[PDB]
Amino acid sequence: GSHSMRYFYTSVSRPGRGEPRFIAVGYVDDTQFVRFDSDAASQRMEPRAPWIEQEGPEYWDQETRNVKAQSQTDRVDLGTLRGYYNQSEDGSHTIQIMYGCDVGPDGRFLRGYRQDAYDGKDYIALNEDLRSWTAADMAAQITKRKWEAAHAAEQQRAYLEGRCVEWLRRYLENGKETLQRTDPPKTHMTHHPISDHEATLRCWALGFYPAEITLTWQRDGEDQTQDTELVETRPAGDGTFQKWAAVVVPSGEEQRYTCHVQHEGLPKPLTLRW
Amino acid sequence: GTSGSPIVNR
Amino acid sequence: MIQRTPKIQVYSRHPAENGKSNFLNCYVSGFHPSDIEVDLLKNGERIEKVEHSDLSFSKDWSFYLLYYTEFTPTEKDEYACRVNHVTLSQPKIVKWDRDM
Ligand SMILES: [Cl-]
């Protein structure tokens, strides 16, 4: 269908514990593919998906160059930010950037993204136009005005609009069997008596790709929200996801309840019954 | 692929 | 400053079946700052060779890690997960449930 490439960078200062920690991860859809750790012995962008291993040392070099350059930038910026928000040296802080791009089935552009946050709170973000910035505060305003004068936006768009989609095209061809797959859920159902007058009814969706799934409970066609428990979609650790939904029902009336599973890997929505 | 320059200081 | 409490969730990669080549997963999310302490336990004693995912986050800015070890279950063995954060007054141990 439609695809997305996303990078997530995390810089964490460690006062008196040496230099700050930079971690960067890259995903296509729900599949991670690259990593880089300031700490880890390597000091290279490492592959974390098979389709990426085919990439030359020329690829790995530039990727490492890029990432270290940001890491050093963040190093400086961590200090500039304490100066801004008048903070002590002893305290540890976090800089995070999340950037990417979406493409339609065509294989062409949809949107771009670049957003920053300092200590988990929104800092600055590039607008949908990829021409303007939004400053979250008085501090972020100095960064905005700086980036405005540097013409950062133009450069951002150039990547976001071009280079970004171009890599995506490539990663999707080169990694079709992994990335262009649709893994429908393994759907079962469990009953757990909590009384002789009550019982929890569980519905399991396991080993599915992508992570986007919808789990809905129904009592004879009528949608249920009255005493439904839904868990946060979690990963298998093998590159598929897990989600379950539960409901409290009166003993015996177990046959009255139905669960509907909506997933991209399903030709038509599934329905389970006890 | 990651973004190279800009990398403008905040 | 943003202080966000972790959301632990101990589970199995495959269905909970006594004595099998399965993985005990523990998934911490919704947290901030990044620095977390996460341990897998076999009857209150620290499982060694426990691996973890690469530090990532959500649109939300909240970090998320998946800590996982290769394991085999028994009715007799109590499996859990210890986690400490700044948001946590003292380590929060969360019991594995075969059907959760
Ligand atoms: Cl920049």
Q: Which of these, A112, A100, A11, A130, lies nearest to B10 by C-alpha position?
A: A11
CA of A155, closest CA in chain C: separation in Å? 23
- b/e per residue, A8-41, with b = 16+ CB within 10 A? bbbbbbeeeeeebbbbbbbbbbbbbbbbbbbeee
Resolution in A: 3.2
Q: Which of these, A205, A209, A200, lies nearest to A231 by C-alpha position?
A: A205
Q: Which of these, A204, A124, A247, lies nearest to C14 by C-alpha position?
A: A204
Q: Do chains C and B touch (3 or more CB pairs under 8 A)?
A: no
CA of B9, closest CA in chain A: separation in Å? 6
Residues of chain A with Cβ-Cβ distance to C32 below 8 Å are 94, 120
CA of B5, closest CA in chain A: separation in Å? 8
| C-beta of residue A82 within 8 angstroms of C-beta of residue A108 | no
Distances (CA, A) of A116 to A10, A70, A133, C17, C60: 10, 13, 11, 44, 11
Residue C35: which CATH number?
Answer: 2.60.40.10
For residue B6, whether the previous peptide bond is cis, meaning omega lies within 30 degrees of 0, is yes
Instruction: Supply angle C-alpha A199, A203, A208, rounded to 5.
Output: 165
For chain A, the domains span 1-181, 182-274
- By C-alpha distance, the chain C residue nearest A200 is C99
Cβ-defined contact of A122 to C61 (cutoff 8 Å): yes
DSSP secondary structure string for all residues of chain A: --EEEEEEEEEE--TTS-SPEEEEEEEETTEEEEEEESSSTT-SPEE-SHHHHTS-HHHHHHHHHHHHHHHHHHHHHHHHHHHHTT--SSS--EEEEEEEEEE-TTS-EEEEEEEEEETTEEEEEE-TTSS-EEESSHHHHHHHHHHHHHTHHHHHHIIIIIIHHHHHHHHHHHTHHHHS--B--EEEEEEE-SSSS-EEEEEEEEEEBSS-EEEEEEETTEEE-TTEEEPPPEE-SSS-EEEEEEEEE-TTGGGGEEEEEEETT-SS-EEEE-
Distances (CA, A) of A11 to A38, A114, A269: 9, 16, 42
Residue C4 domain boundaries: 1-100
One-letter amino acid of A32? Q
| C-beta of residue C92 within 8 angstroms of C-beta of residue C84 | yes
Residues with CB under 5 A from ligand 1 (ion): A 152; B 6, 8
- Which overall architecture, per CATH, does domain A1-181 show? 2-Layer Sandwich (3.30)
Cα separation of A25 and A52, whole Å? 13
Phi-psi region at A107: left, alpha or beta (left = phi > 0; alpha = psi -120 to 50):
left
Q: Which parts of A are annotated binding residues for a peptide antigen?
A: 7, 73, 84, 116, 143, 146, 159, 171
Chain A partners (3+ C-beta pairs within 8 A)? B, C
Structural domains of chain C, count: 1
For residue A168, count CB atoms less than 10 angstroms from its CB and return exposed for 0-12, middle for 13-18, buried for 19 or more.
buried
**CB distance from A130 to chain B under 8 Å?**
no
Indicate the fold that domain A182-274 takes in CATH.
Immunoglobulin-like (2.60.40)
